[PDB]
Design a protein around this ligand. Sequence first.
Ligand code: MG
Ligand code: MG
Ligand code: MG
Ligand code: MG
Ligand code: MG
Ligand code: MG
Ligand code: MG
Ligand code: MG
Ligand code: MG
Ligand code: MG
Ligand code: MG
Ligand code: MG
Ligand code: MG
Ligand code: MG
Ligand code: MG
Ligand code: MG
Ligand code: MG
Ligand code: MG
Ligand code: MG
Ligand code: MG
Ligand code: MG
Ligand code: MG
Ligand code: MG
Ligand code: MG
Ligand code: MG
Ligand code: MG
Ligand code: MG
Ligand code: MG
Ligand code: MG
Ligand code: MG
Ligand code: MG
Ligand code: MG
Ligand code: MG
Ligand code: MG
Ligand code: MG
Lengths: 79, 87, 204, 85
Amino acid sequence: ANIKSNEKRLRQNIKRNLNNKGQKTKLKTNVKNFHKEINLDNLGNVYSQADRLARKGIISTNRARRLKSRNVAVLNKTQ
Amino acid sequence: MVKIRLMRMGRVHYPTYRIVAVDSRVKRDGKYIALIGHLNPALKENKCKIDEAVALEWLNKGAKPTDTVRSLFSQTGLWKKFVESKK
Amino acid sequence: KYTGSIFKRSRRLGFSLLENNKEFSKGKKRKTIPGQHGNRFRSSTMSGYAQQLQEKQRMQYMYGITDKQFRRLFRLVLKQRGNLAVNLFRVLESRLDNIVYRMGFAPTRRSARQLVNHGHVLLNDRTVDTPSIILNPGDKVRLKAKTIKIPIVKAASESGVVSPFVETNNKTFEGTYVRFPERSELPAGINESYVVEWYKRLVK
Amino acid sequence: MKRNQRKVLIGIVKSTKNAKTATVQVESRFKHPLYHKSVVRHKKYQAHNEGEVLAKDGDKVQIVETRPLSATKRFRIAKIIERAK
RNA sequence: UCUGAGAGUUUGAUCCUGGCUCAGGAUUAACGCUGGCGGCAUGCCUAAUACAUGCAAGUCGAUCGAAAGUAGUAAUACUUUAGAGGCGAACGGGUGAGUAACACGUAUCCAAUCUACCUUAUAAUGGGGGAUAACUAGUUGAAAGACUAGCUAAUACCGCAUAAGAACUUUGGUUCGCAUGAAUCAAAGUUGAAAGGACCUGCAAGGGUUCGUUAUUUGAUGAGGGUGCGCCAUAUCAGCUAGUUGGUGGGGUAACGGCCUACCAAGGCAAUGACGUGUAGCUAUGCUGAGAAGUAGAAUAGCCACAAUGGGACUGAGACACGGCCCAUACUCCUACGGGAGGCAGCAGUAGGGAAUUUUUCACAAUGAGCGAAAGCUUGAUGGAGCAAUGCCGCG
RNA sequence: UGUACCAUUUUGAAUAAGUGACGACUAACUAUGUGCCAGCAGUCGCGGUAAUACAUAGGUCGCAAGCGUUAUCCGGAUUUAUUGGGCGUAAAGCAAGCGCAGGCGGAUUGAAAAGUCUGGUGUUAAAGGCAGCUGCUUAACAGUUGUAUGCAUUGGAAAC
Ligand SMILES: [Mg+2]
Ligand SMILES: [Mg+2]
Ligand SMILES: [Mg+2]
Ligand SMILES: [Mg+2]
Ligand SMILES: [Mg+2]
Ligand SMILES: [Mg+2]
Ligand SMILES: [Mg+2]
Ligand SMILES: [Mg+2]
Ligand SMILES: [Mg+2]
Ligand SMILES: [Mg+2]
Ligand SMILES: [Mg+2]
Ligand SMILES: [Mg+2]
Ligand SMILES: [Mg+2]
Ligand SMILES: [Mg+2]
Ligand SMILES: [Mg+2]
Ligand SMILES: [Mg+2]
Ligand SMILES: [Mg+2]
Ligand SMILES: [Mg+2]
Ligand SMILES: [Mg+2]
Ligand SMILES: [Mg+2]
Ligand SMILES: [Mg+2]
Ligand SMILES: [Mg+2]
Ligand SMILES: [Mg+2]
Ligand SMILES: [Mg+2]
Ligand SMILES: [Mg+2]
Ligand SMILES: [Mg+2]
Ligand SMILES: [Mg+2]
Ligand SMILES: [Mg+2]
Ligand SMILES: [Mg+2]
Ligand SMILES: [Mg+2]
Ligand SMILES: [Mg+2]
Ligand SMILES: [Mg+2]
Ligand SMILES: [Mg+2]
Ligand SMILES: [Mg+2]
Ligand SMILES: [Mg+2]
């Protein structure tokens, strides 16, 4: 009543979830740091992490795009 | 990922196929997109009444044929026309 | 599959197989409706339904046809162009065993049917076993060869008495048929066209 | 260029008692399925008076569909003929 | 060029209004009597009741370490796979419970969207690092397993150098649109990639084909949303609705959106039928009718919804996933009493309900599907063969 | 699957007929028994000691590897009448009036073109229906070609 393919897929996606959760938390903390101490330097890090996640497919590329756009809007408004 | 393939509309102990442009994931004997031409295994001669126009259009669009379909295109000579139009 | 009392049925309907072999007989020359209640009054004034049914029964017993086959043939003929009073007569007369009878190679229609079922008959370019194939004038219905030597072949090859609408080319038993039978060749046993209307009502 | 054209509806404003809205009403003469006679119907669509159009009560207004601005709001106002009320 | 038949019955007898009944077709049919065969087609309409048992999605050693077996003095050759990895398991198959509404049919708008493999075209595929499966040893057990410490490999994972073109912005131009608003530049700033395998040649160096990978470009298919119209009965259901209606800022979603949030307002639907109750998957179609249309939504095909009941989520292009995962409920079963296992509305089959509806079968041989270069492998999809006068047709 | 099918292969009518009805609608009648009893029935209705309606037999009729009975759906039913009915005496005109909304509405001119008519285009999946043809010994069946309806857009007509 069980399939080796299904079991192996579960065992793989556990590790994949761990790694992807780590990356997403890193992105969250970087964007939070940017918003906390707004500075044009942190926007670059936000860009890098969002783009890397969007390529890897962990995050939706359109969400990465909207994050970039809204952070740039905040920066342009403040400067 | 449309795929020119066959489809059965015969009866018990008497098959009859139709070459048709249809999607990969849709069941055999289901819904299709464009009709190419019928075929009888026991038609002796001219077993595949081929169209040669919308079939070429769909392979130009990127349809992936099957083994039997490629064979049918081959005896008539549609594979030559496709390859030379590609070139 | 057929009745075994053709004498009784011929005496009831009043019409034999166009030869009166089942009416002349060798006894009593009886031409009355069968059963004890045969010599009674109330002869005419048959209802419309009664006479339609009697005529239909005569028609579909003259050839040994099941009523369901009759409905099938009528549904086949009805859709075409228009008034097919010249087409459905050919349709009814085009039976294979009937054509064998009018060919003259069997003593009786159902005996010809038995021979056809047993496979002593050929076709234009094939062989036929079922005694219901619809024929068309032009097919060379050549008879078998191993059936020409059977102890009962004399009256079969004595086909010189033949209908004009079946042409044999005598002594060659080619037995084709052209010049479809007319109402003259379809005698007064059943010559009516409101059986068509009865089947129009009872069959859509 | 070539651009697909939206569907249009012409109606008369029935009420307007909110912020940037106008509940317009559109009539139609659909035939009856069986007795085959025209029947007058009434449906109250909604639109927004974003600006430059105002379109107060009693104003005969043309209406063009749009992507949904909110729940139950999918229409916007356009040219206004017979300005009254 | 369509195209329609009637009769019996109230009276002592007649005419009319008027109800009942019959003559014709048809079914996923059942029952009684009887029964020979063949060609096609159909065969749990009830308990979305419960299930014993055996099968129903795997594949690749031409991605990778190891292990085993057969040969070989050895070096080594061949075969096989427990495991890592890639792709597929979201297709295909079944059922119609739920659902009276954008569920479905039709016509459209997506200036408000996504799309793996596929098609066309265009740049690269350079160089490093840390780990863990398999294995070893110990603890715990009958075993399932589980925990702890070391050892490895890559097309697994993470950095770095580099952007032909990409994404997000700045500067002004172009052409403008349907109101938000889209389309194209020239320059600039910021951000951003990966992986090699097989084989051939070449003393070597090097070169080459192919599969595959990263970044793009073109279509196509597929998925999602919005709207007009059509789509049951009932007034012996007259008010319903407080995220309900609208506005501002922000968040979230592939996307617009009270989808969500904080603030400010009181609106929105409703006698042209809201809301309530009952019932039902919708459609192409089947049967009937001269026609308008009546009726059932067999088989099959399109779409929707479900997988014992009720929720949540990971991976992924795509699921909130029938035979993947977590939790609760109910039920059944195993135990050596600590703990566990389970979901036939997949193919046969059992119990039960019923008037009533079948093999506990063979083959991937063709068609189709997935992996693979092929060898092939898997395919209860599919093709056959059993059973049944269940229906049409045919013969005795 | 040694299956469909074929042959001068041995034997041999040998291996094969039921069901309903018979007073009228509805094609098809006599006798025996019972005697308002036993029973039949879709409707009218049969049975009270001469039953063609009950039970049996004989005969005959309708179908046939099927025949009857039951259930449901349509027609016949113009019996919810748009096509296609009625309201004095047969079911049906509110007890009468003032009347909002709705339905209908005098004559002529102009404009537009929402209904109406017509041309082009897109679509209405395949299968199914109808017409033609081919293949199964013909058929049932399979395949193949043609074949409408509605919606939307655009271009004209202006009688209502
Ligand atoms: Mg607004
Ligand atoms: Mg708003
Ligand atoms: Mg009387
Ligand atoms: Mg069921
Ligand atoms: Mg292995
Ligand atoms: Mg599925
Ligand atoms: Mg199926
Ligand atoms: Mg239901
Ligand atoms: Mg993938
Ligand atoms: Mg390494
Ligand atoms: Mg990698
Ligand atoms: Mg970098
Ligand atoms: Mg009628
Ligand atoms: Mg169905
Ligand atoms: Mg069903
Ligand atoms: Mg269950
Ligand atoms: Mg994901
Ligand atoms: Mg299962
Ligand atoms: Mg699964
Ligand atoms: Mg089953
Ligand atoms: Mg196969
Ligand atoms: Mg049968
Ligand atoms: Mg028959
Ligand atoms: Mg009786
Ligand atoms: Mg009697
Ligand atoms: Mg009627
Ligand atoms: Mg009735
Ligand atoms: Mg009347
Ligand atoms: Mg009265
Ligand atoms: Mg009065
Ligand atoms: Mg009165
Ligand atoms: Mg008045
Ligand atoms: Mg008024
Ligand atoms: Mg169609
Ligand atoms: Mg057909």
